[PDB]
């Protein structure tokens, strides 16, 4: 209880930051104070609110969080963090309406006293920014923004930094924000990880880390980018015997290192861990809920493949079902929760809860992806709900850098998926050792420019069918979209898509290869658009609906506008 106060219950003062801001814009309160608590991180020791009211009416009762500030410094190849200042608690609201709200800060302590601070008033201008990311109810294969333009997520996972910190993301993050990028994964468990609140207790959070979280949350703030913060991974609930990575022995929860469990099955049922993890996302609420920047919470990494001892299928669904429920409760901005699996085709007892907004896919698979690509998602259309294929790469033990220096492989997959009717890229492991140092932040420019300028939301896409190719010289297959408006088309080569020594194509496209016919009534626009350098290759009016496919070497993309 490093952090305990024994002194009667007193506000000693209030910071502001602007008393007027943007919609959606941060505004962020710091209330330094005494109090008795042995812990500043259990609301049963000190409970910090802030209640707001926009001029409508409406109400949010944000909770408060406890706060370290630090500078931060690289010391050669490590970050370090010096601490300035006591620390102290803070407020983050976000409002979605303009106008005027009215807030007060209300604070109770373990004693049962409560103290408050006047009523003060602040103004919200209109802003830019498009709001929080939800569902869209117009297709519920993609995201939107509350202000109705779609969220379609280009990116990668960027998990965790190397001992440097947020100074790689500095890195990383523009490289792929002016690369199309708008979406990332950030792991906030094990307790190895950058952003880990839980690194020496269950209890308590690092401050620390969660300063480091603000500032690459900041970041993407800035970028225009979305992110997926991951609660858990299943290291934590693995043991050393089983292998894969495994982090039982290490973890804060297991009572051999302080924690309430003895094993990693009773994770899903003490009451003490369910009531620490009921505090750890009420802390995640208060620090990061205001941010429209985060995309979505996930509440595990893989959670099949925690300890075969520990995974009781109607366990892991209950703890999800309640979790989720109460997470969707103290966070005055909802946003989206899901969780993963490591095996491919989910989980459905799970994936089918409601308080699951959308599902995922993990797939490391070496041969024939592109097909188990299409196979996963057209299943997963079950759901009635957004499909994001959350990893992906080959089944190589990590050589994918070694085995495809070029991004082949990532760059069949994200076309695959985005043409497939998934909610966005695929997205790639290995941004550490691949795609940044193996510069492959092209593949993603050249993507995003194709998708861009159409509104999926609108267009009724389905996946293509009803179609025949008539080539002779070459095995050319399809991957595609047919909507009200445009057909989108991804060609590949099947002898040459799956081969990765040669250098990126750059090559003439003058010859005629065959054709493809599709159902569909002319007069028809054709764009033909090369996907390694992003950029329009050729455009042809037809009256026809047999499309001529030009020559290419690996795949080429095609964009049909019904005319
Ligand atoms: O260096 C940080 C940390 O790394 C841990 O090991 C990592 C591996 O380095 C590798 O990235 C591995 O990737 C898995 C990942 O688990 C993911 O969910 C997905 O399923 O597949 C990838 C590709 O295999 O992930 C582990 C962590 O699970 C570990 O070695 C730590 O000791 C070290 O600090």
């Known amino acids: 209880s490093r952090y305990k106060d024994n002194r009667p219950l007193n506000i000693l003062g209030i910071d502001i930051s602007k008393m007027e801001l943007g919609r959606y814009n941060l505004f962020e309160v ?36 406890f706060y370290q500030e630090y500078k931060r410094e690289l010391k050669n190849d490590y970050e370090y963090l010096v601490p300035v200042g006591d620390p102290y608690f803070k407020i983050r609201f976000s409002p979605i309406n303009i106008g005027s709200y009215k807030f007060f800060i209300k604070v109770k302590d373990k004693t049962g006293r409560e103290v408050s601070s006047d009523k003060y008033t602040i103004y919200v201008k209109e802003s830019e920014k498009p709001g929080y990311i939800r569902v869209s109810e117009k297709n519920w294969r993609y995201f939107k923004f509350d202000n109705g333009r779609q969220f379609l997520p280009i990116g990668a996972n960027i998990c965790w930094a190397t001992s440097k910190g947020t100074y790689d993301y500095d890195v990383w993050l523009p490289k792929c924000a002016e690369n199309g990028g708008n979406y990332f994964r950030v792991w906030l468990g094990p307790s190895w990880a950058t952003f880990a609140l839980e690194r020496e207790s269950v209890k308590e959070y690092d401050l620390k880390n969660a300063w480091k979280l603000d500032y690459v949350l900041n970041l993407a703030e800035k970028l225009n980018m979305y992110i997926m ?35 990693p ?35 595990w990494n893989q959670v099949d493949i925690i300890s075969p001892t520990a995974f009781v299928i109607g366990e892991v669904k209950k703890w999800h079902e309640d979790m989720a429920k109460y997470l969707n409760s103290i966070d005055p901005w909802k946003h989206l929760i899901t969780t993963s699996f490591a095996f491919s085709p989910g989980k459905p007892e ?56 070029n991004g082949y492989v990532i760059h069949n997959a994200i076309w695959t998926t985005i043409l497939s009717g998934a909610s966005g890229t695929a997205m790639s492991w290995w941004w550490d050792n691949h795609i940044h140092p193996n510069n492959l932040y092209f593949h ?46 991804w060609l590949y080569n099947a002898k040459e898509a799956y081969q990765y020594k040669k250098d990126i194509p750059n090559m003439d496209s003058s010859k005629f290869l065959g054709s493809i016919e599709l159902l569909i009534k002319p007069p028809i626009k054709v764009i033909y658009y090369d996907t390694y350098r992003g950029e329009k290759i050729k455009e042809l009016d037809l009256d026809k609906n047999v499309i001529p496919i030009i020559e290419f070497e690996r795949d080429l993309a095609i964009k049909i506008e019904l005319l």
């Not at 858990?232 to 309430?260: C, I, V």
């Not at 592109?370 to 990893?391: C, F, N, Q």
């Not at 159409?454 to 002779?472: C, P």
């Open 30 to 65: 710091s209330i330094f104070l005494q109090g008795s608590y042995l812990n500043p991180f259990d609301p049963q020791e000190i409970d910090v609110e802030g209640i707001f009211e926009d001029q409508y009416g409406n109400q949010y009762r944000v909770p408060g969080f």
């Open 229 to 263: 913060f991951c609660f858990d991974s299943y290291n934590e609930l693995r043991y050393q015997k089983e292998g894969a990575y495994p982090y039982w022995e290490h973890t804060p929860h297991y009572e051999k290192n302080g924690g309430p469990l003895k094993e």
């Open 265 to 299: 099955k009773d994770f899903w049922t003490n009451n003490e861990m369910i009531k620490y993890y009921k505090n750890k996302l009420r802390y995640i609420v208060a620090r990061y809920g205001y941010s429209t920047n985060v995309f979505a919470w996930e509440f």
């Open 350 to 405: 799970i994936d089918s809860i409601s308080g699951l907004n959308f599902v995922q896919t993990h797939i490391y698979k070496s041969n024939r992806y592109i097909d188990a690509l299409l196979s996963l998602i057209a299943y997963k259309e079950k759901y009635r709900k957004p499909h994001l294929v959350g990893e992906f790469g080959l089944d190589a033990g990590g050589n994918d850098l070694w085995v495809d220096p």
């Open 444 to 489: 993603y420019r050249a993507l995003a420019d194709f998708v861009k300028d159409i509104n999926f939301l609108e267009e009724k896409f389905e996946r293509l069918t009803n179609y025949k190719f008539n080539v002779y010289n070459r095995e050319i297959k399809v991957i595609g979209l047919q909507g009200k408006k445009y057909i989108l088309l």
